[PDB]
Symmetry: C2
Subunit: 473 residues, 2 copies
Amino acid sequence: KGSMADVPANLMEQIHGLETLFTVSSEKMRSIVKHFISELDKGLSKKGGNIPMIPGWVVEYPTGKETGDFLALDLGGTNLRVVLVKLGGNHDFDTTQNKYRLPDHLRTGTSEQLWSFIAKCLKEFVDEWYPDGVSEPLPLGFTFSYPASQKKINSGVLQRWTKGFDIEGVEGHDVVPMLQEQIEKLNIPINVVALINDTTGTLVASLYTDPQTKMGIIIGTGVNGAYYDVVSGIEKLEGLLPEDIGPDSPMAINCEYGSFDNEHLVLPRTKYDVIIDEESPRPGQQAFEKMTSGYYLGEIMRLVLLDLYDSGFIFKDQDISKLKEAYVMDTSYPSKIEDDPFENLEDTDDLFKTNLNIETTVVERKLIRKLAELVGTRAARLTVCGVSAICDKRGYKTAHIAADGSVFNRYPGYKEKAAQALKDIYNWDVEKMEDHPIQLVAAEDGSGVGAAIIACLTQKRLAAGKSVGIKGE
Amino acid sequence: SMADVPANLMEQIHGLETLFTVSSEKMRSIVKHFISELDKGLSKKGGNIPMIPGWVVEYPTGKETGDFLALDLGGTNLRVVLVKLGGNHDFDTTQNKYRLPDHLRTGTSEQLWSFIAKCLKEFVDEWYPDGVSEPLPLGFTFSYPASQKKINSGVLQRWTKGFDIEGVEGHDVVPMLQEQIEKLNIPINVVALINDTTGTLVASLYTDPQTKMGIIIGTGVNGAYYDVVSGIEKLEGLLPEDIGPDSPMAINCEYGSFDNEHLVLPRTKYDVIIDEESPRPGQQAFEKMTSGYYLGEIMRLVLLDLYDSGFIFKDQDISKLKEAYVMDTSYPSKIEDDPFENLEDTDDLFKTNLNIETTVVERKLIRKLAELVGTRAARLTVCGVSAICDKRGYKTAHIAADGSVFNRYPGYKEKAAQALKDIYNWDVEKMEDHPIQLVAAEDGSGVGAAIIACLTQKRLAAGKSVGIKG
């Protein structure tokens, strides 16, 4: 009975236009899902597609029965962490970790400098927690989130550095023996048995603790999704697989679906999304990421607000200079705006006054709050198309979708928006979000615990002479 | 851990360990005196702990139904909540929140109460646009120090939070609010006034039948629990027939003032300085020792001491460190949360905010200190829990906890659970199976006030008493 109550016609007309632009109907969500499924298939065929659909070489489900000590290394752009995981054999584990800031020089240093530094961290970690030593070398899973290809789980050929890394002699080389040799130079009892993407670990660690997990999903600054296909449904692997990775074998897939619809034929791009892509570092790339990542939501809002300012609707007597800086509005903007509990939107007031030097009227803030809501809701509804596509493709009528990332974890009402979206797509007759057949739930730690459990599943196969990659690798 | 710390500094660290460590023995001795002071507050003579009756004389069953209002008055904001009870330990809520105008703190009484009534009007017109047929019962959370002779009364003893409004101290705030409601014609009855902690207790008992205490651990500290009428000497001869000796009675302890006599709390010289330099020296002793408001200040004074004795920050500009309260709760909290081997979060904190560069060893000392401070505060806080549970013979209990320290201070739940285990020395493995344990509270000052209002309205409708006779 309230809401946009006090908004003048000149402005209400603009909001309606924005509602049209940013609303994704159930019909549109289903049409996207079909194109998505199509692209997942295309990605698993010999021909390939925009969606990479990368085999992760985890060829079995965790049972929950696994036991013992395993390690993870999570190497990022700024930090690494080392994680010790003790598997309890009953869908349970204890963890302990330490975290290390990378020295400034590693970014542009030598290959040796990077791997020897990681190795010193490993030794210091291992010395502390096993004063006496270990019966067997500790299997280690390496989350190496840099573009990298592999023909077996226990390798990773770097395609290219990102995040400002610029180390010679690594691109086009297998990083696993690089690290392994620095480990042994220090005499650390560790075997690097796997290299993974964090999203694969998210899938694996979560299926370990929660048997109903059918997907690992990351929604933050980046987006990605991982799930288990079956070898027999992967045309591109035909003629490449060894005897003991048979057709019924599970195969974890790292989708890298951020690239879905780079053709721009499916997603509902607005004039604002076009500007964002055109002005971005890689125009025409990362289409789905650009439509779902939390990284762009403030930027969408900025461009809308600039458009409305330039057309003379808002901020009429204000100095809007600071709003002219690309990315000046990060994810905290829509987040704080949707989270604002005040009738007069005092948090929104404070955000604009103190960070942008813009004073607003109540009506203006009402429009700003409506705009953040449309943008957040759009993102969730598009994201959930990825989830639905994976479930429909695989026949999962029910599922826990194990979710992580700064948006899922911290964007206000995101869980509610996503559950509503899934309910809209399938048209479920259900009361409470807890009862939805397909539902997002908090993931386990993917880049750490997930990598360690992958190390376990890998070790058991290596110790029995069972393959974990294309025959002859 | 601390292998890199030289011997001379390690001695200073040991000294601080000694000063800030609370033994399980000292915890039990403090509890023993805390129980005595709870008793003295319930006696005719009274004591330093006010032990205010909250006039909630029954337990919620969870079978209550209906539509109920709450008003939560803070120092910055007020919240109006509509609560719908569904008859099964369940509820739906919707709320609005309003910012108090700048001038209210030092304005007139009329200005405060009419602003609040105006917010109530807007809320009711939004959710009941066609009006109602009979008044909506409202519970009013008013957490300032206040005596109560009846559920729907609150005589302000003392403004806090920088409120300085004339003609309120010493007077019942309920009629002042009710009056402005009438002027605007809002179909509301203010049927109850409550302290937030009382609401914490009652709302949490409504959804969790094992709740035996409501506790707030934040800027302010307080606890509430149900005593029994026969254990409240100060009400003897004051009660009507239908509030008998066996009736439950919710008690708002206001135990921040526990041990103002300085006889049991293990105050260090740093605690003494904080007290002497505070706006109310000699008051709020227990609060000063357990509130989150002082945790950074304690650290600030220790560090300043070590600097003055030539141990740390030797070549640093420590001027920012000389300002009182410059270090709020976010300092020990971010420091304890620092996940880096070389304490990189602590580094940025000091450089960026205090313009102080630290060595690795100094940051190890700093982190050690924050742990000591946080741990001490949790152990002293649970002396209050333990005192209430031992007073009433609760051998098992859920302690419904709320407040910025309980909710956000790093590892606090673990420190508190370990402190209870140390006190009782239980035979128990998993922290989740602790006999007496803190659990997350329901919304005290919203959902709690509405439920108390529901309980009160039920008594009134049947003619039953809700205060002293008279």
